[PDB]
Amino acid sequence: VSKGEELFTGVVPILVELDGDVNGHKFSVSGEGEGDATYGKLTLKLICTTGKLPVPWPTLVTTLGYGLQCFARYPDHMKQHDFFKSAMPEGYVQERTIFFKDDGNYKTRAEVKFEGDTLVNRIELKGIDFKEDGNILGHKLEYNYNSHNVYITADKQKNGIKANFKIRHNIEDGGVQLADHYQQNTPIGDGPVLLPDNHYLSYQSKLSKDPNEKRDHMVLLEFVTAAGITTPGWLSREQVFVLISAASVNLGSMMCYSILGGMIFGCFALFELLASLVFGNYLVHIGAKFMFVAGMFVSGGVTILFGVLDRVPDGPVFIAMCFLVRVMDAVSFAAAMTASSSILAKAFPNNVATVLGSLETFSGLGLILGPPVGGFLYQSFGYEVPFIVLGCVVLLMVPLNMYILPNYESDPGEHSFWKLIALPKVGLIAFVINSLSSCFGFLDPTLSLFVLEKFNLPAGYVGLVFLGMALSYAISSPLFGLLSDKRPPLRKWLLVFGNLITAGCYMLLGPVPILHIKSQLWLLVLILVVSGLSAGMSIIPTFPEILSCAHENGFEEGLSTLGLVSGLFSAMWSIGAFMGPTLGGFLYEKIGFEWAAAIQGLWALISGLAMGLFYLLEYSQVQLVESGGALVQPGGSLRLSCAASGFPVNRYSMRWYRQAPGKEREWVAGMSSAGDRSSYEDSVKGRFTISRDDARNTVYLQMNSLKPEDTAVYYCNVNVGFEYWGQGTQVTVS
């Protein structure tokens, strides 16, 4: 942990300057922008100062944007393997040699200094023996730039680091220009520097042009991720503390609710929805550490003040005190649910779906510990004071949770809330949670009364029925959260089919007389535990889906947009609990349970029908599939098909790449964006053939006179603005 990491928490300005010379032609560029190293983002706006550039812009991106090594996003594991910010305020020197294949050479000398809050790098270039008819001076490069991995090694003799890497440039004809970069990074400070081990940095790039700027300009968007060494498997000290603290608050919440589970419900549901909304909006401004101790402290008093309601007689001293308690029952659960969702998804960045299932399963052990209330606490005091004694250990979690939860801070986000509810996808997923919570809240007042009028069973015996539905939720929550995380494209099929079964289960719960199904006890047990399987399969992946929908729209990553999303998850769980039971008592008056379960499910039937056709009709994401590689004897012919989805193939180019086993990936063939020019590898020139079907959205590569040298895994490459590759298929010649 070096000193310079503390100065990088936040958006810091950037300024860039370059004075270069190619073959006696002088040029100079300058610009400004902003970079944030908390989540690895960099925006660089270059403006050419001499008015014209003899070299293409992507040849100089690796000196300008790749010269800003200090905005790397290092994880918690490799804070110690970080050389760039190790002595950052002093600055450092990048000395680069940039070798172009069968072209000239670049020598780069760059100084990085930290003056005030502005980081200024000054770059001197020298270019030699560029060919006039070549790719560089001929300007045959497309206006695109692609991803790369950069490998870092250390050096003790100069106390700095060394690196070697190779970028690829797309050519208008179709080929690839290869550039090999050797950099030496030396620190000019006399303080301690960090010498790391071997690792790499994934660079993702985006090129853009301003609509209003006329003079020759270029806009760089850069994402940097650092990786390279295997995680040890042991969880960090932050991950263990959040998991043990969030599990205990859901255990005690169901523990006290397992004993005490007209205008009051109207007062409750509006101020439960209001407290879940605004207190989730200002999660940035209040502080998530003080949220998780504010909810359980107020909810700790709810367990205490319920006992003292017995002392007062009925009237203004009883009813008005039921007005206050709940308010504190609602707002503190609304606070505890939104706080526990925000603090847990930050702790597990790529495990959001799995840890919700693990958290909600341990809350399903809470109602298993129900009749332990009747063990000794009910037999000792009865109903007067069992609550204050249990409330101590709830309130004794205060010194533990204040010490064991980490402290986070974040700048408030300038996005309005809103805009988020105006999305087409957030609106339809709000309808599903409204529909799913409506069907859950109907059975709480009304299932026991149907059994009483038909099967004539006591409500204590109906208490076993409710544990039948909770037994299926507890086992469905981890497994359906386990499969939600590993396959992100199938969470949209997993959730819509979850609501569709719930419509079908509830259709047959109280059977319509047209259906001619006889109702009995063993059928009621079987049909309800299936409904637990369907409800748990639809309630778990709706939180990572909204988090996925926010980041694709353009919202930032961190504590800001996580707070606004988790506020809605408590909010749309509350609107189901308002129109569920209250209209449930309305619709129970009309006909009865033989239709009140059928009409409850048609609203869930239209809920899965509306969003299910929204995902089906207009899903679009860039995916590429290869198929057809097999065992071919030498001298034969083969055909390989790359199929594309998400983008039109007519206006973009397609390339092919090979991977021999144990060898570096190499380019095979390319076609221009106009469908007129093409290029091939020089070793296989004239023996392969590239082709496409534009209206079919397919590209084909045909192989004539195969040799054992061509045994490789083949991939299919496209540049939309971000680089995409296909899965790749293996071709063996033997």
- Tally of contiguous helical segments: 20
Specify the overall morphology.
globular
- Which oligomeric state applies? monomer
Number of strands: 22
Biggest beta-sheet profile: 11 strands, mixed, barrel
Provide the CATH architecture of the largest domain: Beta Barrel
Tally of individual domains = 4
**CATH level 1 name of the largest domain:** Mainly Beta
CATH topology description of the largest domain? Green Fluorescent Protein
Structural class label: alpha+beta
CATH superfamily of the largest domain, please?
A: Green fluorescent protein
Can you list the strand order of the major beta sheet? 1-2-3-11-10-7-8-9-4-5-6
Q: What is the alpha-carbon Rg in Å? A: 32 Å
**Percent in helix:** 40-55%
Proportion of residues in extended strands = 15-25%
PDB class: membrane protein
Keywords: membrane protein
Assembly: monomeric
Entry title: The spd-bound structure
Structural overview:
This protein is an alpha+beta fold. The protein folds into 4 domains: 3-227, Beta Barrel (Green Fluorescent Protein); 235-325 and 327-409, Growth Hormone, Chain: A (Up-down Bundle), CATH 1.20.1250; 411-417 and 419-619, Up-down Bundle (Growth Hormone, Chain: A), CATH 1.20.1250.20; 623-733, Immunoglobulin-like (Sandwich). The chain contains 20 helices and 22 strands. The two termini are 54 Å apart.
